[PDB]
């Protein structure tokens, strides 16, 4: 076919999602146990202008909050700021809480996103952590608080919650420890992202996958050592390769070694001229060896 | 927010998915009410040689099957052909059956896929029905029985099951009417597909997306009238575009009209000349207007 960006399934998350409001602010909250996490800015009286939190947490009549799963409401007990995330102890443990574990995504790691609009999940798509800690999601008005999750061996991990969008378009969110990814703040301010660093690990996988679906026009006898490639890497914003390991697998199923790809990269780093790979016209790093292996002829 | 192929939640569908064996043959199945639906080739003795489904059904014996969710088995009390879909009556009603209707997908229409392996849901991704009634499902071995479905107004529609992959890589499945999309057959026989006919509506949606995602190079002050475009199309493997009416929303939001984008197509169809569009190296038609609107600035 191609290679296409899948998402792992979502049924385990959908019940834990709710509609948290507060004033004119309607968004989505995650509901695990008697807790309900969500972007803090829901409290803020005017999100369209620099925010003074603290101040805002000082006159927040808990009775005004408004949580609901479908048209079935919930009562609020406490609420504690935790990083950029807001916590709400509700008066009704969630019967659908999924066995899980929290973590955070390192750059170049793929993960699923479940965009929601006022408590209702609307779509499911996988994404990827850019070097600067932002994602090219596809968020818009009302998807704040959407949840991002991963599964690694029957373990459902919660890793992301959506907050805001940069001036350039990139989407910013927090991990569940209350940490906004990329250190960005929850302020309608002009904040920069800084150059994006292409994930080498992930670009190699992309090329392997290409071979796999019978695509080779971009592979020629000639090769670069991790050394060499590594240099160039440091000049054209590509992560660096530590061990040609990882790909031994693919390197076998296709006989071609990384070395032969690192060269490809460099040739390809300035357009495919008129050709394409897996339908892509430029190099892509949204996939990880895991995905190529799991997606392609494999587990 | 660039443009990503998304899927709709897998929540409702995920329970419904079961594992079916008969023989050396294992796949996936769908469990609704007291019935389980799965490809009838499950029963075919040797699935690598021409099959006679009537000789096979002739030697079928219930106790020879196997149906289960998790490791909990169900008792088959009946099995039958309805076209190419094997329907199986079992001793138990799925308590998790969701309010559902059935339906058929038309060319150019998109829908969600839950690629499953031996009973377990493993991923969700959107797809698009090609002119020839096939799709580029990223289907592998062990995915047979994978279910397709859509959600409209809040009604769940089951519309696809999987069966086989053509010699050209494309993927063929069946509607729940027991009909094989494309009129293909569950025979390991050499069946061609026939040159593909792109979706003009979907391609226009695509270009609108790009414009909304801030791309313009391919923009010129040129325009091709409707009738003019359709004559070009009918001889260029693009579908007749019978109504710019579907494009009013996007048109007003970008300032560009279908006719301007029409000419863009005739031009761009001659290869992007080296550049890319929304990262693709050539034209895409796997995005309906509906998706682009809903997905971009709009509902
Ligand atoms: C979710 C909330 C929503 O629906 O609010 C309606 C009022 C957004 C999600 C956002 C919508 C589009 N895609 C998305 O992901 N949350 C926000 O609106 C945040 C709120 C802050 C309190 C954190 N706002 C923004 O993302 C906005 N970002 C900008 O502020 C960027 C940084 N800024 C600019 O470069 C600039 C100038 C001015 C004035 O405001 N921003 C976005 C501009 C709406
Ligand atoms: C899902 C089943 C599975 O579990 O297989 C276990 C072997 C079905 C999956 C395929 C695999 C790749 N993607 C995908 O969707 N498929 C089957 O294996 C079917 C079964 C038969 C009984 C319908 N077979 C195929 O899809 C084959 N299709 C071919 O028949 C193709 C048309 N081939 C030729 O031109 C030709 C010549 C001979 C001999 O066979 N095909 C593929 C080739 C396995």
Residue numbers in the entry:
A (entry chain B), B (entry chain A): 1 to 299
Which sentences from the paper describe this structure?
The pivotal roles played by Mpros in controlling viral replication and transcription through extensive processing of replicase polyproteins, together with the absence of closely related cellular homologues, identify the Mpro as a potentially important target for antiviral drug design.
We therefore solved the crystal structure of SARS-CoV and TGEV Mpros individually complexed with N1, which revealed a common mechanism of inhibition among CoV Mpros. N1 binds to TGEV Mpro in a similar mode to SARS-CoV Mpro with some subtle differences. Unlike the SARS-CoV Mpro complexed with N1, the TGEV Mpro lacks a water molecule connecting the ethyl ester with the side chain of residue 142 (Asn → Ala in TGEV Mpro). Second, another water molecule in the TGEV Mpro complex occupies an equivalent position to the 189-Gln side chain, which interacts with the backbone NH of Leu at P2 in SARS-CoV Mpro–N1 complex. This water molecule, however, donates a 2.6-Å hydrogen bond to 47-Thr and accepts a 2.7-Å hydrogen bond from the NH backbone of Leu at P2. Third, the isoxazole sways to interact with the backbone atoms of residues 188–189. It is worth mentioning that these slight variations do not notably affect the Ki, as the binding modes of P1, P2, and P4 remain the same as in SARS-CoV Mpro.
